[PDB]
């Protein structure tokens, strides 16, 4: 009896293929195809059409009427999110020459404070603390302000450089902490790399389309007009970067594209007038590499070369740097190596293996050469987690300690120092989580689903340890995965309102994401294999059901943005698997949007999903496009969040989708559309806002699953 809004049909036709005067791609169908979209009119580029507005106000009214009984729970949940944030905080301090550096956040203030304490003292507010740079002071009276970099000049740290942008154009000027020197450097990308003894520093300028194209040396006490430019790459596929070797003796200059690199070395021992670069390996298309210096004579190179898609690490001499015959760490199908950092006594590798983030360590042999047999992987007790080396906090080249960051669905982020040789760990900073959180109450684990083609898909799940595992329990299954993003099983206080009410909270690491490495995205779920994203997700839900963890009556799912594509297709395919669902700013008008280059992101996104103006993609994309596959079947309760002026998805997509669902669905569940009408074109996010949206959706799920009350 009590149906939500259904929009009147207005015949309109959408054309796919070649259209005079429009850039529809390099190979559009000729002649083109036409299909009817009777709800096309809900789109207004202007966001102001009165008939469109009257319709969305019907949606506002139906939403309000229907959220009456979840308002108080939403507010409880919001209170929970609030209590999880520490407005007063200090970061993990780290040695940097004769100081301990750290950041602080203060209760009433928007920006951080960059602080320092002498070598032997206790980090924190007090007589000992020296406030190096207070961003609130820079920010004062300004509408936009972002610091790119705070950069103390090594040995002494008497000059500290910093970069600031007050414009929002991502161009930064470089200034000095309380004008110790007068020098000012304009037109930079925000980064600052010191040369030795505070004599000079290095910076990068841009040209067309704000592309980083030149590396410069600025000598302190000189006008910028005299800066020497060391390097230029004006190939528009390439961007430049500059870094400093760990021992501080060598500058590393590089050009990078999405698939090709090139590095050059500059000797910093030769003074401010020596500008001649040393070529590492010339540019070769499809060959990626990164260079790190072990001392001054040897390079450790992480590369793609010779089909090592997952990376190999190579050891070469400065005097013959194109000879990459010596493999320190061979390629391995199982292991992904994303980077290396080198120190005097060991190198540290980062990447993934078996779906998780990993860190590896390699030491010196008894002979001062790096040694393969030394390779170890840092091990953890829990089955799913996140772990990273934090080399922004490793400022001392001859260290024995690693600085590490661990986080898990059980464990708020912990920073610790670990001994490279023994493996002894010492806590530096463990995150505080308020509102009664304690780690011992929770357990996380790994499950493996099996897709139709036989491929194993990992799931990370967490729950409160007091639930009855001898029966099935209310569950939330989250999925993204496009663009090769990994949805990490890291700590996230935002699932606590679920988990604290008896729910199992689960992530499906489906193809399209990047969790299993290189090919999990690029062959696994992209272009004409994209359907794997949805089939994998379903396989995860079925595994959770066949193993006894849940049942369809007690299962929920959610995705946001490109993850909204996932929920949309999955609800057409297997809505029987889910009692209630969420879809934030969901990408659901796939065909009608992807055909049309007038819509802002369309053109770029051809390189993700494909171009339905082309024969190659028309039917395939049409097979999963959510709006296009809505039909007369039972769907679960659903809540859609979107925004009139939100740039994550054009407002009309979720509006068309909700109208269509209500028009054809055969069930009597509710589809709610929470549509922000008030935020404007330039409105900034704001974070308390995101928590308010999170809270009402979570209240929705919790109502429908019948788990309103806290467990403890």
Author numbering: 3 to 714
Give the article text:
The overall structure of TbOPB comprises the typical 2 domain α/β-hydrolase and β-propeller architecture that is present in all members of the PREP family structurally characterized to date. A short N-terminal segment (residues 1–87) and long C-terminal segment (residues 436–714) together form the α/β-hydrolase domain, whilst the region in between (residues 88–435) forms the β-propeller domain.
To this end, we have determined crystal structures of T. brucei OPB in the ligand-free open state and antipain-bound closed state. One interface involved contacts between the ãβ-hydrolase domain of one molecule with the β-propeller domain of the neighboring molecule, and included a disulfide bridge between Cys169 of each molecule. Without the closed state structure to compare with, it would have been easy to wrongfully assume that the lattice contact was the biological interface. With hindsight the lattice contact involving both domains and a disulfide bridge would impede the inter-domain flexibility needed to allow opening and closing of the enzyme during catalysis (discussed below), and therefore could not be the biological dimer interface.
